[PDB]
Amino acid sequence: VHSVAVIGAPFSQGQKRKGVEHGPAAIREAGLMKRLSSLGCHLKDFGDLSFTPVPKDDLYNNLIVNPRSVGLANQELAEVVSRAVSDGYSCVTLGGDHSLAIGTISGHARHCPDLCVVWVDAHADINTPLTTSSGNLHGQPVSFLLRELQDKVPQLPGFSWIKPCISSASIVYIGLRDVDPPEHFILKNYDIQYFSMRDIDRLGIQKVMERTFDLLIGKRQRPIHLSFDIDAFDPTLAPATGTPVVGGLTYREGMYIAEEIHNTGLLSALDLVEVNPQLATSEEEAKTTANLAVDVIASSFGQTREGGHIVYDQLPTP
Amino acid sequence: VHSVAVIGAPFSQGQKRKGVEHGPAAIREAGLMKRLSSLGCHLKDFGDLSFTPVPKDDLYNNLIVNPRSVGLANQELAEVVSRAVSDGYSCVTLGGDHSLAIGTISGHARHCPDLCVVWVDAHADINTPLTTSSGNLHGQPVSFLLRELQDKVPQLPGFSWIKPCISSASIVYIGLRDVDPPEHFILKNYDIQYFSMRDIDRLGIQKVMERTFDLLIGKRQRPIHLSFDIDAFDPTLAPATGTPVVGGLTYREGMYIAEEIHNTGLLSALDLVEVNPQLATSEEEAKTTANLAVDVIASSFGQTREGGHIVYDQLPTP
Amino acid sequence: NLYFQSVHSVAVIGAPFGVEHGPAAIREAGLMKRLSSLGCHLKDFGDLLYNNPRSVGLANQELAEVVSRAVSDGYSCVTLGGDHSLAIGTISGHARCPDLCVVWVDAHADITTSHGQPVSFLLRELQDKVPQLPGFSWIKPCISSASIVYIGLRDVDPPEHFILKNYDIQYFSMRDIDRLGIQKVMERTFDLLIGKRQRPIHLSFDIDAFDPTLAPATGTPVVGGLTYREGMYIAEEIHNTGLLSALDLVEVNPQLATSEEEAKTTANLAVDVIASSFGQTREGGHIVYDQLPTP
Numbered sequence: 053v054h055s056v057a058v059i060g061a062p063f064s065q066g067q068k069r070k071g072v073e074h075g076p077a078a079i080r081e082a083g084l085m086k087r088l089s090s091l092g093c094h095l096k097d098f099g100d101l102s103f104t105p106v107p108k109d110d111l112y113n114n115l116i117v118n119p120r121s122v123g124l125a126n127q128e129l130a131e132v133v134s135r136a137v138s139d140g141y142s143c144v145t146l147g148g149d150h151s152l153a154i155g156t157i158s159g160h161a162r163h164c165p166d167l168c169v170v171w172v173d174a175h176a177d178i179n180t181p182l183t184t185s186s187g188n189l190h191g192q193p194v195s196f197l198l199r200e201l202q203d204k205v206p207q208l209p210g211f212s213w214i215k216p217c218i219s220s221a222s223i224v225y226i227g228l229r230d231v232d233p234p235e236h237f238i239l240k241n242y243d244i245q246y247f248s249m250r251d252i253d254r255l256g257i258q259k260v261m262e263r264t265f266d267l268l269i270g271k272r273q274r275p276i277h278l279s280f281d282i283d284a285f286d287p288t289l290a291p292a293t294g295t296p297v298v299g300g301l302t303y304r305e306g307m308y309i310a311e312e313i314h315n316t317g318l319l320s321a322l323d324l325v326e327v328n329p330q331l332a333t334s335e336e337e338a339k340t341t342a343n344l345a346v347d348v349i350a351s352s353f354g355q356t357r358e359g360g361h362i363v364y365d366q367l368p369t370p
Numbered sequence: 371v372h373s374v375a376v377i378g379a380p381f382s383q384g385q386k387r388k389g390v391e392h393g394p395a396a397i398r399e400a401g402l403m404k405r406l407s408s409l410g411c412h413l414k415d416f417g418d419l420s421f422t423p424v425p426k427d428d429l430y431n432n433l434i435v436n437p438r439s440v441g442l443a444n445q446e447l448a449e450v451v452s453r454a455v456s457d458g459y460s461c462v463t464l465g466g467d468h469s470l471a472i473g474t475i476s477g478h479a480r481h482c483p484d485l486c487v488v489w490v491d492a493h494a495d496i497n498t499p500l501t502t503s504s505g506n507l508h509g510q511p512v513s514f515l516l517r518e519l520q521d522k523v524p525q526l527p528g529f530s531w532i533k534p535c536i537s538s539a540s541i542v543y544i545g546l547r548d549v550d551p552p553e554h555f556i557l558k559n560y561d562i563q564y565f566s567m568r569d570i571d572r573l574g575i576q577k578v579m580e581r582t583f584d585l586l587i588g589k590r591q592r593p594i595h596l597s598f599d600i601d602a603f604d605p606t607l608a609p610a611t612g613t614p615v616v617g618g619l620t621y622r623e624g625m626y627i628a629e630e631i632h633n634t635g636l637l638s639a640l641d642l643v644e645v646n647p648q649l650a651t652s653e654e655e656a657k658t659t660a661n662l663a664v665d666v667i668a669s670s671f672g673q674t675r676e677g678g679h680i681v682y683d684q685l686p687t688p
Numbered sequence: 689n690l691y692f693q694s695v696h697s698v699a700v701i702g703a704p705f706g707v708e709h710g711p712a713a714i715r716e717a718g719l720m721k722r723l724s725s726l727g728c729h730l731k732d733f734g735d736l737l738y739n740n741p742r743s744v745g746l747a748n749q750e751l752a753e754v755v756s757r758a759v760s761d762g763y764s765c766v767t768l769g770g771d772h773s774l775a776i777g778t779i780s781g782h783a784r785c786p787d788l789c790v791v792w793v794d795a796h797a798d799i800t801t802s803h804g805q806p807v808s809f810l811l812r813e814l815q816d817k818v819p820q821l822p823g824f825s826w827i828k829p830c831i832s833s834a835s836i837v838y839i840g841l842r843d844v845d846p847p848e849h850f851i852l853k854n855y856d857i858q859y860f861s862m863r864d865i866d867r868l869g870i871q872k873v874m875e876r877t878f879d880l881l882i883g884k885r886q887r888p889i890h891l892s893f894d895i896d897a898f899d900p901t902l903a904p905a906t907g908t909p910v911v912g913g914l915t916y917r918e919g920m921y922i923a924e925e926i927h928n929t930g931l932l933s934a935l936d937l938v939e940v941n942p943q944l945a946t947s948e949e950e951a952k953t954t955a956n957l958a959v960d961v962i963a964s965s966f967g968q969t970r971e972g973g974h975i976v977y978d979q980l981p982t983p
């Protein structure tokens with residue numbers, strides 16, 4: 053019996069495309085709670101958080117957009133995640149853009165300092181505020197969290213509260229296929245392990261999961277933080293997303309990652325981000341993406357493709 | 371060269387979605403007979419059976435749907451299949467819902483004491499009339515056929531003619547992804563071998579086919595009954611079906627299963643079920659599903675990806 | 689960007705043999721910009737019955753002399769199609785490099801006929817089986833049986849199957865990829881073609897080798913093709929040898945598109961294959977970043 057807390061983080065200021073703030077409601081509408089309930093989960097829904105707005109919030113170094121707004125909302129979200137983690141709940145945060153991982157990972161690390169991160173995404177999201185070309189904070193969350201990158205990251209307004217909480221050996225990426233040249237340099241120079249789409253093509257997702265766990269939990273059991281960007285899946289499967297990139301995970305591969313995460317029994321927090329129902333060309337495309345998000349979450353807590361989630365031990369007789 | 375019999379079974383009373391009775395007409399219209407002719411098949415067309423309706427056949431024990439109609443249609447179907455097999459043909463039955471495997475497998479076992487079954491489906495179709503939640507008989511056919519379950523299956527009206535004819539070690543499932551808790555218990559408890567979509571994700575379809583044949587025909591040659599539900603394919607490939615489940619077989623995997631079955635030279639009967647042209651959103655969706663059904667059957671009788679079905683003896687010289 | 693993992697010299701030619709709208713569709717999808725972004729030294733050449741053997745044979749003679757000039761100057765020649773018949777011209781022109789090996793990526797063997805016969809005119813062992821066509825006398829066979837490897841085969845005609853089987857032409861059909869996986873297929877392909885010695889590689893890529901969901905705007909689409917990932921993998925491994933000498937990107941037919949999304953997706957895919965053949969990858973790393981800025 054897993055105790056699962058659901059937190060809606062209708063965060064959109066980490067990027068420029070509107071509608072990602074409607075991701076939590078779309079996921080709940082696709083039957084998230086009914087699905088987790090059927091798995092036997094003990095649920096708590098915090099509903100959607102109302103983040104303190106920052107009306108006077110100008111560009112940092114004439115590039116970084118909404119720093120105070122993103123920094124403050126993450127500060128507040130980190131308090132909610134920390135509380136849920138303290139109360140014994142596996143914390144599911146529904147996005148919202150991927151800048152929310154600053155708050156969920158920060159919050160989680162307060163009570164789980166030995167956590168490890170499995171980052172599932174088409175993107176590395178590891179640009180520093182000095183390497184970003186877009187100035188979108190959803191493309192930089194990992195830079196604020198990485199201990200080894202601290203001397204390369206300037207102090208941004210609203211971001212001072214953040215204490216880097218993950219080391220380069222404690223994060224593994226899966227699904228990479230659109231990596232900026234500064235991000236590629238960071239991954240190689242700081243020895244951050246990753247399994248790009250090319251590594252999945254060669255090894256197969258089973259070997260990718262085995263190797264990920266060898267790297268992270270090969271020495272001891274640790275709390276796992278699964279940060280899952282819906283754009284890790286091929287755009288044909290997850291169209292309702294801001295930055296789609298062709299040649300992503302199949303439905304089967306995404307289910308396989310989540311099932312392996314469930315099988316460890318170590319999942320402590322999960323982010324499901326970048327579902328933007330507004331970017332779907334049709335209502336069915338929006339529902340398809342939202343149904344996929346529920347499937348990743350439910351598989352992370354026991355949903356299988358073999359029907360082995362529920363205890364059944366005796367057949368009825370005539 | 372193969373002797374192949376074709377039987378149309380326009381039957382829908384094993385489920386609640388209207389239209390699956392039009393599956394045989396849709397498959398025939400897709401050019402099935404012309405395709406089998408082009409492969410050099412000696413063909414016998416038994417036409418499309420008209421099933422004796424049961425006007426008074428309502429809900430049994432507040433659960434079982436249409437038992438008298440399903441039992442009778444299967445009794446009639448078993449006699450036609452028995453005729454085709456005893457005449458010496460490899461029996462192709464076009465569905466119609468998956469409750470029709472009661473008739474095809476019963477009819478086939480009347481001549482093949484050592485028959486084995488390869489069941490390709492998103493579903494196990496092995497609930498008993500006591501474990502079913504829906505009461506739909508297309509989700510229960512294997513329970514009536516399996517010897518090990520005889521003491522778990524109640525006597526339904528119209529089912530007294532059925533004799534269990536297969537052992538738990540004589541059926542292998544491929545493609546499973548939507549299994550009920552009692553069905554998972556039955557599969558594990560009785561040691562029925564299955565390769566779910568997760569097993570295919572891990573092993574690959576080559577190893578799945580090798581292991582299937584090792585389990586079934588590794589000790590001795592045996593007639594093979596291929597019970598193929600079109601919903602084993604991903605819904606993007608087979609949209610015109612009643613219970614679609616995302617994350618199915620690819621076109622390539624489906625053809626590979628069919629090619630490997632052909633390569634044994636032991637195919638004795640094939641069911642191609644659950645094509646429901648009415649559930650397609652367009653004519654092209656219905657046609658794609660029908661064409662896929664024809665490709666499975668043709669590959670099961672020799673159609674290949676390398677174009678080696680037709681023998682070429684001499685190249686023209688100048 | 690000033691630093692790159694590798695610098696290649698690349699020549700681009702448009703051969704519009706609605707398949708004629710193919711080179712224009714590829715160009716409009718930003719091909720030149722993409723190759724420039726990879727640190728390539730670019731040279732754009734612009735856009736150029738028996739039993740149309742004259743017109744096909746003529747257009748191919750112009751293409752073969754343009755390809756021969758580009759490869760003579762030391763450029764890796766890229767030809768935008770147009771139908772696959774242009775491969776007679778490009779492989780002949782490139783051969784004028786005699787020890788060239790071919791990697792034919794197609795749903796079809798293109799090798800008795802009923803764009804489906806280019807390999808018959810080029811293969812040495814098939815010379816005593818091919819008749820003297822009008823405006824085809826200038827062609828001499830250049831590639832032997834053990835120098836062409838097919839990848840992606842799924843629609844092979846009975847006389848083609850006999851040719852492949854009896855002339856011992858090694859191939860990896862869709863069924864072979866299903867069994868081995870694309871990694872093993874590339875490892876085995878290179879074991880066959882360059883295991884003995886290094887050789888200029890001719891990659892003739894038909895867009896229909898990919899599944900029709902990915903490349904819908906093509907002439908002869910065949911279901912159950914290569915995924916986007918498999919095709920990129922082929923191109924990346926070809927790049928990783930450091931031997932790519934010529935490449936054809938054929939059968940993009942923008943007049944067969946039933947929507948703008950089907951038109952743009954097919955052209956974008958064709959740009960992706962070419963870019964991956966000259967260094968573009970899923971991991972990045974093609975562009976070399978020196979140092980991180982400090983606050």
Ligand SMILES: NC[C@@H](CCC[B-](O)(O)O)[C@H](N)C(=O)O
Nearest residue numbers: 468493495497504506508509613
């Ligand atoms: N959720 C699927 C269904 C069975 C589908 C039968 B099939 O489509 O395979 O024929 C369920 N287990 C049931 O018992 O009603």
Ligand SMILES: [Mn+2]
Nearest residue numbers: 150173177281
């Ligand atoms: Mn992300």
Ligand SMILES: [Mn+2]
Nearest residue numbers: 174175281283
């Ligand atoms: Mn992303």
Ligand SMILES: [Mn+2]
Nearest residue numbers: 468491495599
């Ligand atoms: Mn079925």
Ligand SMILES: [Mn+2]
Nearest residue numbers: 492493599601
């Ligand atoms: Mn089924």
Ligand SMILES: [Mn+2]
Nearest residue numbers: 772794798894
């Ligand atoms: Mn071709």
Ligand SMILES: [Mn+2]
Nearest residue numbers: 795796894896
């Ligand atoms: Mn082709």
